[PDB]
């Protein structure tokens, strides 16, 4: 998690994506699986945006722009978010309770899918 300071795909197609994330406690350079580049492009991630990336799934959520850039324009339709405080890399060991019905209903219908039948569903 952090503000994006650099977003550079490395061509061999794309072998990997090098990203630079900034927090109050420093800057970290990350090598991303090339499949995350599609997610980063879909989320419209640019330098100065505050994002988080899930390590296990590659999911990207762009949760606004950094408030340090709030004055780059006098009127933009943007959501400006504070820079994250902790480290870029956050680890948490959690215990979550689920029921068998949750697993049943999760497998009743497909999720996502870029096909036309999936989208119409």
């Amino acid at each position: 998690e952090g503000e994006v300071t650099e977003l550079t795909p490395c061509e061999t197609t794309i072998s990997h994506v090098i990203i630079g994330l900034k927090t109050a406690k420093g800057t970290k350079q990350l090598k991303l699986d090339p499949s995350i580049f599609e997610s980063l492009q879909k989320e419209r991630v640019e330098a100065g945006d505050v994002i988080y990336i899930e390590a296990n799934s590659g999911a990207v959520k762009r949760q606004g722009r950094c408030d340090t850039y709030a004055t780059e324009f006098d009127l933009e339709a943007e959501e400006y978010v504070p820079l994250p405080k902790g480290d870029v890399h956050k680890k948490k060991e959690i215990i979550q309770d689920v029921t068998l019905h949750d697993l049943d209903v999760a497998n009743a219908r497909p999720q996502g899918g870029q096909d036309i039948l999936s989208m119409m569903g």
Partner: peptide
């Protein structure tokens, strides 16, 4: 006078 961003220009 306001300096507009891309999203407000689109809106």
């Amino acid at each position: 006078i306001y300096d507009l961003g891309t999203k407000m220009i689109e809106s």
